[PDB]
Amino acid sequence: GGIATREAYGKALVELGQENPKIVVLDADLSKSTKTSDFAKAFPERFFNMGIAEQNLMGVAAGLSTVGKIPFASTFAVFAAGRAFEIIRNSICYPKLNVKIAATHAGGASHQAIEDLALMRVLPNMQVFVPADAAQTRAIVKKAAEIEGPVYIRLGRSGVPEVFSPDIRFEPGRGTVLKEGKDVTIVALGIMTAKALEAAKMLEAEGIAARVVDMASLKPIDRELLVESARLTGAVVTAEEHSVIGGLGSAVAEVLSEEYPIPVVKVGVNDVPQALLEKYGLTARDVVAAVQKALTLKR
Amino acid sequence: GGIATREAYGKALVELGQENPKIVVLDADLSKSTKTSDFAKAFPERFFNMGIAEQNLMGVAAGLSTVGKIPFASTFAVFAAGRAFEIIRNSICYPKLNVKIAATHAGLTVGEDGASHQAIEDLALMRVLPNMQVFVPADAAQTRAIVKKAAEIEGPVYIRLGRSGVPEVFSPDIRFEPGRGTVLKEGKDVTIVALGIMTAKALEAAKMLEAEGIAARVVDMASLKPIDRELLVESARLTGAVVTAEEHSVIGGLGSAVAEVLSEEYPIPVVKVGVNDVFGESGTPQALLEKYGLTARDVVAAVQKALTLKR
Amino acid sequence: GIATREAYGKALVELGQENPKIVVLDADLSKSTKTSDFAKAFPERFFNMGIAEQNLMGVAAGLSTVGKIPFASTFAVFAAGRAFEIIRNSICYPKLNVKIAATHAGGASHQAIEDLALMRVLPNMQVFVPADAAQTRAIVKKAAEIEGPVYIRLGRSGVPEVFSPDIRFEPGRGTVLKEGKDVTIVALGIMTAKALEAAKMLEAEGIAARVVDMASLKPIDRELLVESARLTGAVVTAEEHSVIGGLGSAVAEVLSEEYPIPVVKVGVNDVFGESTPQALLEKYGLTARDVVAAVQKALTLKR
Amino acid sequence: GGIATREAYGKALVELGQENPKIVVLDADLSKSTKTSDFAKAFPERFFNMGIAEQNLMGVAAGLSTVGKIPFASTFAVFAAGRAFEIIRNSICYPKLNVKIAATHAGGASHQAIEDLALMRVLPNMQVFVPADAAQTRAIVKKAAEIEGPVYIRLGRSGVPEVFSPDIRFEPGRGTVLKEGKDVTIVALGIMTAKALEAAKMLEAEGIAARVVDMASLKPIDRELLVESARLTGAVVTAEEHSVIGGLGSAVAEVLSEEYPIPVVKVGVNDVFGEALLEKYGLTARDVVAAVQKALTLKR
């Protein structure tokens, strides 16, 4: 029972505020919890909390980034994929502004943005990071503050299992081998990383040794680690709480098809808390099933 | 060459208007050319020519589709990827409204220096939306077939059109079906999958490859979404390597769709020809990309790389 | 009596039966909206889609130029905020034939206390505020016949009956509901019935008040204001709206240039969103008793 | 032939910057003239020159005001009345944020905001100041920096006649008697103040003594001075380069009808038609003269 990535994000911003005087935080939420958050109390002069439309909040972030601030804009994936999309694309990505978008994803059907990562991935300059747990969130937030350019960080509201130690360092374009195995590689991000580890345990019990790779860095992706995993194991399963189109599965297939073609079987949302994970097919057992399918495709 | 796909579209709408009384056409352009287009003159009571913002034009199309009309909204890829994106996604795709978007895409030619005003990732943005089907005609004849089919199918459709004349590839009586592509040439060494302007260039490339002893199958895949999975898998089993070619970003378009399919069904090399740097590779001048585009020779180079990846 | 919002819904059905060019737009996706009388009677002329309110106004604008007469159901808070620019720039300056039916909720921002003032200052916009069900029906029918932008302010709660079912509405014409020689009370919306209550209370103290309903805020009935001024020598205005830029301001503008007399304004003085209907009226000072007090002040100002 | 109020504004910001470290200036204009303006050169770290949409510029001003800055947002009246209106009303006025909007007003028909003052006047908490000349602009800008709350200052690009001395002090809610007269009072603001003085001269030549009042403080308006002028002269003419509805004439009528009813005859824009201009719109000294003659006949 580790804390939510959204909660880890809030704590990481307080540390960043202490260490980096250029960091500013923007939030359009006017609730009491927001106004009395740790960042709000510790750095009131760098906390921009106003009742303004989400697309306008992104526009403010854009402006502040051009005058020497490093804005972290707290928002929701549904806004990023909808009403704020145009400003993100036209004002932030093409001009390459230094805005960090911290988008909470709630895990109609529209109000669930199942393709947020896909939309951000296709924009120029945008980097897309999906922390697995509290410790990785902190590492991603600190790194995002130091890199130049637009960043999308996907967060969650519910507690998620601990996967990494507190002193992990994050680097864009670098993933992590969490477990070794020669028969298949499972590449996962977000909540699916812990489930990939669970799946690898279940697979061991049936005589299948799975390498498990965390790929929080969805864009830019770790091409060399994917190619090395492909050469060693000969088959990949990707797992993401996201549409199977345009996310991790697509990014991995795009890389391997041009470098070292092997089976890539995608676990994700196919169509449009636990009962919904189960209906969409985002359990450890779903990953197991995908691995069995990946093994049959080896040639 | 043949006429522009944008021009074929306008003519096809006139025929549709004659055959199908539910078809309505929306266009925000108030120029003389628009007001006196053939559809405008033939069916003025079904031509909604309204000087409103492009997102509002799409909102009218959305509304008209819910009251029994079949709206064809003529717009630009720049609007679809920008100011109209939210209404397309939230009002048309998620609710699955019966709107056909005919989006003219500008050539590979930066505007003033607004690279954004190019919309080089239009197909990718439409592809990832639920329910949206994405069709990219190669020439006049295929445009007509796509427009007529789009009118009959239920649900949101994005049709990408072009302003410049493009070579004839298909015969006038071609039939289009979503999910079905076409083998234009047979060959056992590699398959070239292309759409839009790249289809004719893939045929040119196949000729150049023959002269070097490489026999290329060429497939037209105007139906980007849903894609022809069976034809891709058959091509993969027969030839063992694919090159994709699209006048579009290499991320999220045809190359990505093909790689997604083959990696889960029959993994083989998929080498992608498309726009790599959306600002222009800061090496070669603008005049070069403007004169050439992506070329048959680029497809040739991609094929040679694909052959080395066979295992 | 029923809510003006409810009378509006019924009137649209009648309009639909008589006028084939009428279309209704509504962004509300609730079951009540999808099964409203107009939705059921004229589904082919009902545009119900989840789109932003400013886009709904933009759609109404477009539809008005292709032969439809669009009635755009919205809220006063949207008209005064997110939809304001499209209303001003796309509908008013170009003079498009759009009818805005804005339900006014009776935070601070989420209460548009200046909706009428913002609409009044726009060119070409006419502004009508029905007192009750019968006047709503009359205003909706007239709005469909006039050419040009109209703002009709509606409410969600039941309001007392004031007019008979055969009332005719004409823009630019108000109505003397009660005669009196000492003062004139000019009111609109919910304040019309309260003006009648106030006039009864005033009669019991020997003050005879003329009561005028001015649902037609813009264009205002200048002639009736001037005649009331000449006959009674003092006016009280009453509106559920800011004292700046609404009925009181419109009346003062007219009388100061034609027949200057006291105009004492009853309305919202300061924002302070106070979350009961009655407690709200009392805190803002919109009761019959407040109108009585205003009349007493108006009498002392006669010169 | 003094300088433009927009130019006086630029100069006043430099002084404010020297005296007040919390002042920040926002401008979306990316031209060379803006980037090398005096404020830009003197205080580059407090000049936020960002090519963003005008409504986003206002959003930045809003945010900066809540973190201890005193932002002056340079914009145009057409943006305040259009694309930036919603942020001004919903983000700045209702929450009562400390933002000063310096709106240049150009002197379709939409792109001329003839009702900018009316739109700002009706919003809660917004104060509205319309300087007549360079000296009053400086005074208004300096005062705006000290008061708490949203302010709208209307500026112009063209040179305007000098009306006030360089050391004038401005106070919200206070107007100024510029000339005494017992027969009528002319209340004016902006460019109309100089013309009211011209009209008063013309009226003197016909035996009519007009008091002239400058009312740069449109909101809050100087109620006491209006009532005193009404008691002393018995008739008012208002003059504004603005729609006759919802501006100065309406503000004066609102006050006098509830305190001391007298004729208020309004000179202003009657009819919108983006179009010799002063003459067609009816904003000349002679128009003010004609209004005075009408006001005299209305005395009872």
PDB file of N, CA, C and O in Angstrom, chain C residues 80-82 84-85 88-89 93 108 111-114 118 121 244 249 252-253 256-257 260-263 265 271 301 303, chain D residues 81-83 85-86 89 94 110 113 115 119 121-122 124 245 250 253-254 257-259 261-266 272 298 300:
ATOM      1  N   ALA C  80     -23.403  35.571 -19.846  1.00  0.00           N
ATOM      2  CA  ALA C  80     -22.674  36.695 -19.284  1.00  0.00           C
ATOM      3  C   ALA C  80     -21.170  36.398 -19.217  1.00  0.00           C
ATOM      4  O   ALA C  80     -20.408  37.311 -18.958  1.00  0.00           O
ATOM      5  N   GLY C  81     -20.756  35.149 -19.456  1.00  0.00           N
ATOM      6  CA  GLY C  81     -19.373  34.753 -19.294  1.00  0.00           C
ATOM      7  C   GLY C  81     -18.816  34.104 -20.553  1.00  0.00           C
ATOM      8  O   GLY C  81     -18.433  34.809 -21.492  1.00  0.00           O
ATOM      9  N   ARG C  82     -18.736  32.773 -20.554  1.00  0.00           N
ATOM     10  CA  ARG C  82     -18.046  32.060 -21.629  1.00  0.00           C
ATOM     11  C   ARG C  82     -18.686  32.280 -23.001  1.00  0.00           C
ATOM     12  O   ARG C  82     -17.969  32.206 -23.990  1.00  0.00           O
ATOM     13  N   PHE C  84     -20.254  35.113 -23.908  1.00  0.00           N
ATOM     14  CA  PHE C  84     -20.488  36.533 -24.122  1.00  0.00           C
ATOM     15  C   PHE C  84     -19.865  37.008 -25.424  1.00  0.00           C
ATOM     16  O   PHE C  84     -20.461  37.785 -26.179  1.00  0.00           O
ATOM     17  N   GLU C  85     -18.622  36.615 -25.662  1.00  0.00           N
ATOM     18  CA  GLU C  85     -17.899  37.149 -26.820  1.00  0.00           C
ATOM     19  C   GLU C  85     -18.579  36.714 -28.131  1.00  0.00           C
ATOM     20  O   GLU C  85     -18.687  37.488 -29.063  1.00  0.00           O
ATOM     21  N   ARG C  88     -21.741  38.738 -28.529  1.00  0.00           N
ATOM     22  CA  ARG C  88     -21.484  40.106 -28.959  1.00  0.00           C
ATOM     23  C   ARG C  88     -20.979  40.134 -30.400  1.00  0.00           C
ATOM     24  O   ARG C  88     -21.516  40.871 -31.235  1.00  0.00           O
ATOM     25  N   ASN C  89     -19.909  39.368 -30.676  1.00  0.00           N
ATOM     26  CA  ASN C  89     -19.186  39.524 -31.936  1.00  0.00           C
ATOM     27  C   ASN C  89     -19.866  38.770 -33.081  1.00  0.00           C
ATOM     28  O   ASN C  89     -19.810  39.227 -34.207  1.00  0.00           O
ATOM     29  N   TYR C  93     -23.427  42.284 -33.289  1.00  0.00           N
ATOM     30  CA  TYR C  93     -22.923  43.207 -34.305  1.00  0.00           C
ATOM     31  C   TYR C  93     -23.413  42.794 -35.687  1.00  0.00           C
ATOM     32  O   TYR C  93     -23.933  43.634 -36.405  1.00  0.00           O
ATOM     33  N   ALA C 108     -20.593  33.267  -6.198  1.00  0.00           N
ATOM     34  CA  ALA C 108     -20.961  34.625  -6.587  1.00  0.00           C
ATOM     35  C   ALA C 108     -21.013  34.707  -8.112  1.00  0.00           C
ATOM     36  O   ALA C 108     -21.940  35.313  -8.661  1.00  0.00           O
ATOM     37  N   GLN C 111     -23.794  33.210 -10.166  1.00  0.00           N
ATOM     38  CA  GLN C 111     -24.968  34.061 -10.203  1.00  0.00           C
ATOM     39  C   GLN C 111     -24.605  35.254 -11.088  1.00  0.00           C
ATOM     40  O   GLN C 111     -23.717  36.055 -10.781  1.00  0.00           O
ATOM     41  N   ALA C 112     -25.299  35.366 -12.211  1.00  0.00           N
ATOM     42  CA  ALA C 112     -25.123  36.486 -13.113  1.00  0.00           C
ATOM     43  C   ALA C 112     -26.052  37.621 -12.680  1.00  0.00           C
ATOM     44  O   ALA C 112     -27.191  37.690 -13.141  1.00  0.00           O
ATOM     45  N   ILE C 113     -25.552  38.529 -11.831  1.00  0.00           N
ATOM     46  CA  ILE C 113     -26.400  39.603 -11.328  1.00  0.00           C
ATOM     47  C   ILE C 113     -26.470  40.741 -12.343  1.00  0.00           C
ATOM     48  O   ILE C 113     -27.237  41.662 -12.150  1.00  0.00           O
ATOM     49  N   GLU C 114     -25.658  40.694 -13.393  1.00  0.00           N
ATOM     50  CA  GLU C 114     -25.592  41.782 -14.370  1.00  0.00           C
ATOM     51  C   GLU C 114     -25.894  41.274 -15.797  1.00  0.00           C
ATOM     52  O   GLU C 114     -25.540  41.930 -16.804  1.00  0.00           O
ATOM     53  N   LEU C 118     -25.442  43.500 -19.325  1.00  0.00           N
ATOM     54  CA  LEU C 118     -24.525  43.155 -20.404  1.00  0.00           C
ATOM     55  C   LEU C 118     -25.275  43.015 -21.726  1.00  0.00           C
ATOM     56  O   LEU C 118     -24.789  43.482 -22.760  1.00  0.00           O
ATOM     57  N   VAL C 121     -26.466  46.556 -23.305  1.00  0.00           N
ATOM     58  CA  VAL C 121     -25.503  47.464 -23.926  1.00  0.00           C
ATOM     59  C   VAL C 121     -25.049  46.973 -25.295  1.00  0.00           C
ATOM     60  O   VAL C 121     -24.389  47.703 -26.012  1.00  0.00           O
ATOM     61  N   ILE C 244     -27.115  48.625 -11.204  1.00  0.00           N
ATOM     62  CA  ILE C 244     -26.357  49.290 -12.251  1.00  0.00           C
ATOM     63  C   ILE C 244     -26.645  48.591 -13.583  1.00  0.00           C
ATOM     64  O   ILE C 244     -26.435  47.384 -13.722  1.00  0.00           O
ATOM     65  N   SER C 249     -31.517  51.843 -14.340  1.00  0.00           N
ATOM     66  CA  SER C 249     -30.678  52.661 -15.208  1.00  0.00           C
ATOM     67  C   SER C 249     -31.407  53.041 -16.495  1.00  0.00           C
ATOM     68  O   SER C 249     -31.352  54.188 -16.930  1.00  0.00           O
ATOM     69  N   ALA C 252     -33.985  55.740 -15.563  1.00  0.00           N
ATOM     70  CA  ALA C 252     -33.298  56.994 -15.250  1.00  0.00           C
ATOM     71  C   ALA C 252     -32.785  57.630 -16.529  1.00  0.00           C
ATOM     72  O   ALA C 252     -32.888  58.841 -16.683  1.00  0.00           O
ATOM     73  N   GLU C 253     -32.203  56.826 -17.429  1.00  0.00           N
ATOM     74  CA  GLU C 253     -31.739  57.365 -18.710  1.00  0.00           C
ATOM     75  C   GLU C 253     -32.876  58.093 -19.437  1.00  0.00           C
ATOM     76  O   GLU C 253     -32.681  59.175 -19.965  1.00  0.00           O
ATOM     77  N   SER C 256     -34.419  61.299 -17.259  1.00  0.00           N
ATOM     78  CA  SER C 256     -33.507  62.425 -17.095  1.00  0.00           C
ATOM     79  C   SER C 256     -33.426  63.260 -18.369  1.00  0.00           C
ATOM     80  O   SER C 256     -33.105  64.446 -18.301  1.00  0.00           O
ATOM     81  N   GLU C 257     -33.689  62.649 -19.538  1.00  0.00           N
ATOM     82  CA  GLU C 257     -33.621  63.398 -20.793  1.00  0.00           C
ATOM     83  C   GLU C 257     -35.019  63.856 -21.247  1.00  0.00           C
ATOM     84  O   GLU C 257     -35.131  64.635 -22.157  1.00  0.00           O
ATOM     85  N   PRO C 260     -37.572  64.898 -15.942  1.00  0.00           N
ATOM     86  CA  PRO C 260     -36.793  64.465 -14.774  1.00  0.00           C
ATOM     87  C   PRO C 260     -37.661  64.398 -13.521  1.00  0.00           C
ATOM     88  O   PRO C 260     -38.313  65.373 -13.178  1.00  0.00           O
ATOM     89  N   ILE C 261     -37.644  63.263 -12.836  1.00  0.00           N
ATOM     90  CA  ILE C 261     -38.351  63.046 -11.583  1.00  0.00           C
ATOM     91  C   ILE C 261     -37.527  62.051 -10.760  1.00  0.00           C
ATOM     92  O   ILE C 261     -36.603  61.415 -11.291  1.00  0.00           O
ATOM     93  N   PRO C 262     -37.862  61.836  -9.466  1.00  0.00           N
ATOM     94  CA  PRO C 262     -37.166  60.838  -8.670  1.00  0.00           C
ATOM     95  C   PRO C 262     -37.362  59.452  -9.274  1.00  0.00           C
ATOM     96  O   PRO C 262     -38.475  59.055  -9.600  1.00  0.00           O
ATOM     97  N   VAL C 263     -36.254  58.715  -9.390  1.00  0.00           N
ATOM     98  CA  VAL C 263     -36.281  57.299  -9.711  1.00  0.00           C
ATOM     99  C   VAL C 263     -35.471  56.599  -8.637  1.00  0.00           C
ATOM    100  O   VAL C 263     -34.254  56.705  -8.634  1.00  0.00           O
ATOM    101  N   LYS C 265     -34.264  53.078  -7.024  1.00  0.00           N
ATOM    102  CA  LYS C 265     -33.986  51.809  -7.673  1.00  0.00           C
ATOM    103  C   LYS C 265     -33.924  50.704  -6.629  1.00  0.00           C
ATOM    104  O   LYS C 265     -33.130  50.782  -5.717  1.00  0.00           O
ATOM    105  N   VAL C 271     -22.833  42.126  -4.740  1.00  0.00           N
ATOM    106  CA  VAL C 271     -22.704  40.700  -5.060  1.00  0.00           C
ATOM    107  C   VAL C 271     -23.072  39.742  -3.914  1.00  0.00           C
ATOM    108  O   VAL C 271     -24.160  39.186  -3.895  1.00  0.00           O
ATOM    109  N   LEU C 301     -38.608  62.764  -2.243  1.00  0.00           N
ATOM    110  CA  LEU C 301     -37.725  63.434  -3.190  1.00  0.00           C
ATOM    111  C   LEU C 301     -38.484  64.346  -4.156  1.00  0.00           C
ATOM    112  O   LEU C 301     -37.834  65.063  -4.923  1.00  0.00           O
ATOM    113  N   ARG C 303     -40.179  67.418  -5.802  1.00  0.00           N
ATOM    114  CA  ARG C 303     -39.756  68.801  -5.653  1.00  0.00           C
ATOM    115  C   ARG C 303     -40.733  69.717  -6.398  1.00  0.00           C
ATOM    116  O   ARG C 303     -40.855  70.898  -6.080  1.00  0.00           O
TER     117      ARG C 303
ATOM    118  N   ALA D  81     -13.402  43.851 -24.456  1.00  0.00           N
ATOM    119  CA  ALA D  81     -14.825  43.741 -24.717  1.00  0.00           C
ATOM    120  C   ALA D  81     -15.168  42.411 -25.399  1.00  0.00           C
ATOM    121  O   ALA D  81     -16.332  42.093 -25.512  1.00  0.00           O
ATOM    122  N   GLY D  82     -14.164  41.665 -25.880  1.00  0.00           N
ATOM    123  CA  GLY D  82     -14.395  40.456 -26.652  1.00  0.00           C
ATOM    124  C   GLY D  82     -13.724  39.228 -26.026  1.00  0.00           C
ATOM    125  O   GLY D  82     -14.201  38.647 -25.038  1.00  0.00           O
ATOM    126  N   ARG D  83     -12.587  38.854 -26.607  1.00  0.00           N
ATOM    127  CA  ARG D  83     -11.940  37.599 -26.246  1.00  0.00           C
ATOM    128  C   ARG D  83     -11.473  37.567 -24.788  1.00  0.00           C
ATOM    129  O   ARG D  83     -11.443  36.491 -24.223  1.00  0.00           O
ATOM    130  N   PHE D  85     -12.985  39.176 -22.260  1.00  0.00           N
ATOM    131  CA  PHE D  85     -14.044  39.631 -21.381  1.00  0.00           C
ATOM    132  C   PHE D  85     -14.301  38.602 -20.285  1.00  0.00           C
ATOM    133  O   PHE D  85     -14.518  38.918 -19.116  1.00  0.00           O
ATOM    134  N   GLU D  86     -14.376  37.340 -20.685  1.00  0.00           N
ATOM    135  CA  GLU D  86     -14.763  36.302 -19.745  1.00  0.00           C
ATOM    136  C   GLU D  86     -13.742  36.170 -18.603  1.00  0.00           C
ATOM    137  O   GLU D  86     -14.130  36.028 -17.434  1.00  0.00           O
ATOM    138  N   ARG D  89     -14.146  39.200 -16.329  1.00  0.00           N
ATOM    139  CA  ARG D  89     -15.305  39.132 -15.446  1.00  0.00           C
ATOM    140  C   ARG D  89     -15.142  38.013 -14.423  1.00  0.00           C
ATOM    141  O   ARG D  89     -15.300  38.242 -13.219  1.00  0.00           O
ATOM    142  N   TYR D  94     -15.115  39.186 -10.238  1.00  0.00           N
ATOM    143  CA  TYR D  94     -15.800  38.486  -9.162  1.00  0.00           C
ATOM    144  C   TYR D  94     -14.849  38.153  -8.029  1.00  0.00           C
ATOM    145  O   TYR D  94     -15.156  38.443  -6.882  1.00  0.00           O
ATOM    146  N   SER D 110     -17.362  45.912 -34.877  1.00  0.00           N
ATOM    147  CA  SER D 110     -16.991  45.147 -33.696  1.00  0.00           C
ATOM    148  C   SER D 110     -15.594  45.516 -33.189  1.00  0.00           C
ATOM    149  O   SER D 110     -15.400  45.627 -31.973  1.00  0.00           O
ATOM    150  N   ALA D 113     -14.585  49.150 -30.118  1.00  0.00           N
ATOM    151  CA  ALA D 113     -15.346  48.857 -28.914  1.00  0.00           C
ATOM    152  C   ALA D 113     -15.979  50.155 -28.419  1.00  0.00           C
ATOM    153  O   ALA D 113     -15.395  50.849 -27.608  1.00  0.00           O
ATOM    154  N   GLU D 115     -18.578  50.385 -26.632  1.00  0.00           N
ATOM    155  CA  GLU D 115     -19.263  50.145 -25.365  1.00  0.00           C
ATOM    156  C   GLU D 115     -18.302  49.555 -24.315  1.00  0.00           C
ATOM    157  O   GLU D 115     -18.733  48.974 -23.310  1.00  0.00           O
ATOM    158  N   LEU D 119     -19.283  48.041 -20.535  1.00  0.00           N
ATOM    159  CA  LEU D 119     -19.100  46.647 -20.140  1.00  0.00           C
ATOM    160  C   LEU D 119     -18.297  46.566 -18.850  1.00  0.00           C
ATOM    161  O   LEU D 119     -18.617  45.768 -17.975  1.00  0.00           O
ATOM    162  N   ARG D 121     -18.044  48.984 -16.528  1.00  0.00           N
ATOM    163  CA  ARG D 121     -18.784  49.641 -15.448  1.00  0.00           C
ATOM    164  C   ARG D 121     -19.717  48.658 -14.749  1.00  0.00           C
ATOM    165  O   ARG D 121     -19.926  48.771 -13.542  1.00  0.00           O
ATOM    166  N   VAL D 122     -20.341  47.741 -15.516  1.00  0.00           N
ATOM    167  CA  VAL D 122     -21.391  46.923 -14.896  1.00  0.00           C
ATOM    168  C   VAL D 122     -20.799  45.734 -14.153  1.00  0.00           C
ATOM    169  O   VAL D 122     -21.524  45.042 -13.459  1.00  0.00           O
ATOM    170  N   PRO D 124     -18.923  43.788 -11.150  1.00  0.00           N
ATOM    171  CA  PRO D 124     -18.615  44.083  -9.750  1.00  0.00           C
ATOM    172  C   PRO D 124     -17.120  44.311  -9.529  1.00  0.00           C
ATOM    173  O   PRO D 124     -16.292  43.663 -10.170  1.00  0.00           O
ATOM    174  N   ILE D 245     -25.369  54.774 -24.175  1.00  0.00           N
ATOM    175  CA  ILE D 245     -25.981  53.850 -23.234  1.00  0.00           C
ATOM    176  C   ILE D 245     -24.872  53.205 -22.397  1.00  0.00           C
ATOM    177  O   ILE D 245     -23.949  52.614 -22.930  1.00  0.00           O
ATOM    178  N   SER D 250     -25.267  57.579 -18.526  1.00  0.00           N
ATOM    179  CA  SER D 250     -26.062  56.665 -17.723  1.00  0.00           C
ATOM    180  C   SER D 250     -25.662  56.769 -16.253  1.00  0.00           C
ATOM    181  O   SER D 250     -26.523  56.791 -15.377  1.00  0.00           O
ATOM    182  N   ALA D 253     -27.110  60.055 -14.875  1.00  0.00           N
ATOM    183  CA  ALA D 253     -28.562  59.945 -14.766  1.00  0.00           C
ATOM    184  C   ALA D 253     -28.937  59.063 -13.588  1.00  0.00           C
ATOM    185  O   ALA D 253     -29.882  59.368 -12.871  1.00  0.00           O
ATOM    186  N   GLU D 254     -28.218  57.946 -13.409  1.00  0.00           N
ATOM    187  CA  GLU D 254     -28.507  57.052 -12.300  1.00  0.00           C
ATOM    188  C   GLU D 254     -28.394  57.816 -10.975  1.00  0.00           C
ATOM    189  O   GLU D 254     -29.228  57.672 -10.090  1.00  0.00           O
ATOM    190  N   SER D 257     -31.067  60.991 -10.688  1.00  0.00           N
ATOM    191  CA  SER D 257     -32.471  60.612 -10.592  1.00  0.00           C
ATOM    192  C   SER D 257     -32.819  60.152  -9.178  1.00  0.00           C
ATOM    193  O   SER D 257     -33.972  60.245  -8.776  1.00  0.00           O
ATOM    194  N   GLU D 258     -31.825  59.639  -8.424  1.00  0.00           N
ATOM    195  CA  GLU D 258     -32.099  59.163  -7.077  1.00  0.00           C
ATOM    196  C   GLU D 258     -31.724  60.219  -6.030  1.00  0.00           C
ATOM    197  O   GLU D 258     -32.063  60.070  -4.877  1.00  0.00           O
ATOM    198  N   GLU D 259     -31.079  61.334  -6.423  1.00  0.00           N
ATOM    199  CA  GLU D 259     -30.649  62.279  -5.395  1.00  0.00           C
ATOM    200  C   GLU D 259     -31.142  63.695  -5.664  1.00  0.00           C
ATOM    201  O   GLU D 259     -31.519  64.372  -4.734  1.00  0.00           O
ATOM    202  N   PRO D 261     -33.140  65.219  -9.023  1.00  0.00           N
ATOM    203  CA  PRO D 261     -33.487  65.026 -10.432  1.00  0.00           C
ATOM    204  C   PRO D 261     -33.454  66.339 -11.203  1.00  0.00           C
ATOM    205  O   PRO D 261     -34.086  67.292 -10.807  1.00  0.00           O
ATOM    206  N   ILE D 262     -32.723  66.362 -12.313  1.00  0.00           N
ATOM    207  CA  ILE D 262     -32.625  67.503 -13.203  1.00  0.00           C
ATOM    208  C   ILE D 262     -32.419  66.955 -14.621  1.00  0.00           C
ATOM    209  O   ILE D 262     -32.113  65.781 -14.800  1.00  0.00           O
ATOM    210  N   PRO D 263     -32.537  67.789 -15.671  1.00  0.00           N
ATOM    211  CA  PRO D 263     -32.215  67.349 -17.026  1.00  0.00           C
ATOM    212  C   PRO D 263     -30.782  66.842 -17.130  1.00  0.00           C
ATOM    213  O   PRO D 263     -29.862  67.520 -16.696  1.00  0.00           O
ATOM    214  N   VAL D 264     -30.612  65.652 -17.721  1.00  0.00           N
ATOM    215  CA  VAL D 264     -29.303  65.150 -18.120  1.00  0.00           C
ATOM    216  C   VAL D 264     -29.367  64.812 -19.600  1.00  0.00           C
ATOM    217  O   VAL D 264     -30.035  63.844 -19.963  1.00  0.00           O
ATOM    218  N   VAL D 265     -28.741  65.643 -20.434  1.00  0.00           N
ATOM    219  CA  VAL D 265     -28.721  65.449 -21.872  1.00  0.00           C
ATOM    220  C   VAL D 265     -27.371  64.855 -22.276  1.00  0.00           C
ATOM    221  O   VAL D 265     -26.330  65.444 -22.021  1.00  0.00           O
ATOM    222  N   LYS D 266     -27.393  63.723 -22.967  1.00  0.00           N
ATOM    223  CA  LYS D 266     -26.223  62.904 -23.227  1.00  0.00           C
ATOM    224  C   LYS D 266     -25.661  63.136 -24.628  1.00  0.00           C
ATOM    225  O   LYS D 266     -26.364  62.991 -25.593  1.00  0.00           O
ATOM    226  N   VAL D 272     -23.820  52.704 -34.016  1.00  0.00           N
ATOM    227  CA  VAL D 272     -22.621  51.987 -34.430  1.00  0.00           C
ATOM    228  C   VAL D 272     -22.635  51.869 -35.958  1.00  0.00           C
ATOM    229  O   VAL D 272     -23.623  51.420 -36.541  1.00  0.00           O
ATOM    230  N   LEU D 298     -35.200  72.090 -20.900  1.00  0.00           N
ATOM    231  CA  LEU D 298     -35.841  71.070 -20.087  1.00  0.00           C
ATOM    232  C   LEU D 298     -35.993  71.462 -18.620  1.00  0.00           C
ATOM    233  O   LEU D 298     -36.637  70.714 -17.873  1.00  0.00           O
ATOM    234  N   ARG D 300     -37.407  72.863 -15.292  1.00  0.00           N
ATOM    235  CA  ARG D 300     -38.799  72.947 -14.882  1.00  0.00           C
ATOM    236  C   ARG D 300     -38.897  73.688 -13.546  1.00  0.00           C
ATOM    237  O   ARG D 300     -39.934  74.267 -13.250  1.00  0.00           O
TER     238      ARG D 300
END
